[PDB]
Write a protein that binds this ligand. Structure first.
Ligand SMILES: [Zn+2]
Ligand SMILES: [Zn+2]
Ligand SMILES: [Zn+2]
Ligand SMILES: [Zn+2]
Lengths: 210, 210, 210, 210
């Protein structure tokens, strides 16, 4: 069957839900959240945050990177924002992220190296900041955290968002991170709602300042 | 708190797992599966297929589209393939997918319209096929199904994959679909392992042929 | 100097223009043409068409490919269209194009292979057509010609364009090709102005029909 | 004819070359230069530098931007480098570039705005530097100049290039700029050949330092 195993672990699943409710999911209304995360899908957005599936609309690229010009992601955002009128977008880094570890420790990898230059660009812009944590684990954490913020800086700079605020659509964009280790999910005091941007982030970034 | 609610529904979650095992996830080894899916993350890859989280490495774009040139996805694939040496890649469409419905019913949407031209391109190439299902629900289904295959045709045409076969890395790429309605997950008889491509797909596509 | 030679062949150039007129170019008004062409910049857009430089606003990618989702090109088009209100956009293939020859003769090349899958996709969709020219030179030509058209089909499907027609901006998009061999530049009877698309192209494509 | 005018200004051109030599261009060997430039194709790469056409292989995007992940450009570079074994790649900004002026003077434009965030990112990283030129013309110039360098920093960070040096292919990448005003073409003392990168650029950047 090639994946006999999986279709098996599946009819197994479908059984486990006697609560005749797949009907309930298929009747679930719009999502009110966009979650951008790492392909290292350690834990599913909803599950973490304790929501029903699909209550969260979801993108996943290596290292939850938002490129100014990556139409893969922007398409996901124009859709979620303009058409599902979600209330909150949120970039979510995760501690122990392979993308960030591979880039931090300038490890050659092949093609994705090119995408991770986007994360190495954050290492650059906060080089100074990252020194006064002379370690590994300390930096690593601080890097994946600052990743999640400069990603939000990227969202909020997208035309889509500016245009959505411009036309008076209520919306807010969070820099957020969660530990596969403890489950526990860190607010970064990064959550933008109009373009009072410079202010709301300096804050978030200063809450490293060794 | 802005999302007080969510951090609440979270410490709630973390409690629910007394089985002191977050340790078990943080110790989880490489994934052996890449799952490309719709941002319409109705259900999390693992959960469906009944696996632990992170056992499945995951990308999500609107309409589980693989572009020949979308480095957002390719980066995800070079990584998963070349570096996590996953055994199986699988594109997974889902019935009732908003991306496919929006494109099928040539609905103006804004920017994502441009990304969905990739799905309208599948509507074109199988125009003939899609007629002899003169309906809606019948087509819609048949379209999202054929989406998942021509996406696999796109993966298998990527340099990454050809190069991985070329250097004798065992790997296989499945066209797959699942119903939010029933949970049940359809094999499409689309699962490629060397470039005997033309053969293995004609098959899969012919299993529509009204 | 590393390129001493070039800065030399340059002060040489600047001399050659006594007609104190660089002033004339720096005072040149908006372009009224967008020209998408092959990086194989055999001949500069303007020169061919006998215009002053900059009278033509210009993009160049391998094989004058327009991707539905390539923001490199779309950015160039939104700019040229929306902001320089150019009257005519035109995709221009060229005979003996390395991109098309490399893809036609399924030659492994490395990364660009992935971009040329876009040209191999045109080879696919007109496979039938391309057979009844059982040769090489005949096909090759016919392929690079059909490239230039399905590229125009891609432009005209872009939101940018539809939106520009929608808001009553006069604009028209030509499928065009030129021979490095003879200089002479072929009209393809492919030049769209509203979305009477299906009509205006069938035409252009039928003018192969061996 | 729609463009009767252009096909006219063309048979006009082809005449003007009695020197029966289109044959000479069609027999022209590989290019030894890649030139990345602004779509604002004020002047054709070759012409400036006083070379025959096609002696220069050419990309053009708004503001001669190199994205880490823009496969439109990277494809052009892998091709030029790996397959035409060009000796020198060179990013070329131009004074009075619309892309840079539009972004510098944070002018809303539509979609290209998103691509120009790449140029606004250079404005950010050298914010300090750009202040001590309290003007307009002075900054503008200094910005388009620094654009051309951080673009080269982007090329040289591409896998393609590192891999080409790694396998002992002789190659060198110049930050370069030219004035539509005077024709004259500025060396920036930015021309990298191995990854002694940090050194060779600090230099180039310091030659602003008001
Ligand atoms: Zn990760
Ligand atoms: Zn979907
Ligand atoms: Zn060409
Ligand atoms: Zn320019």
């Amino acid at each position: 069957s090639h994946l006999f195993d999986n279709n098996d672990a599946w009819v197994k699943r479908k059984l486990a839900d006697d609560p005749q409710y797949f009907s309930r999911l298929a009747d679930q209304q719009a999502p009110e959240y966009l979650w951008i995360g790492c392909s290292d899908s350690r834990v599913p957005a909803n599950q973490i945050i304790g929501l029903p599936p699909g209550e969260v609309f979801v993108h996943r690229n290596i290292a939850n990177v938002v490129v100014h010009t990556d139409l893969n992601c922007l398409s996901v955002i124009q859709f979620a924002v303009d058409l599902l009128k979600v209330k909150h977008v949120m970039v979510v880094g995760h501690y122990g992220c392979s993308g960030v570890n591979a880039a931090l420790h300038n490890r050659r990898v092949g093609l994705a190296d090119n995408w991770l230059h986007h994360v190495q660009d954050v290492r650059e812009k906060h080089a100074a900041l990252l020194e006064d944590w002379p370690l590994g684990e300390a930096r690593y954490r601080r890097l994946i955290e600052l990743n999640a913020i400069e990603q939000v800086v990227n969202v909020c700079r997208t035309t889509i968002v500016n245009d959505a605020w411009a036309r008076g659509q209520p919306l807010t964009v969070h820099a957020l991170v969660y530990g596969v280790h403890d489950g526990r999910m860190r607010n970064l005091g990064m959550a933008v709602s109009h373009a009072e941007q410079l202010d709301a982030t300096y804050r978030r970034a200063v809450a490293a300042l060794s």
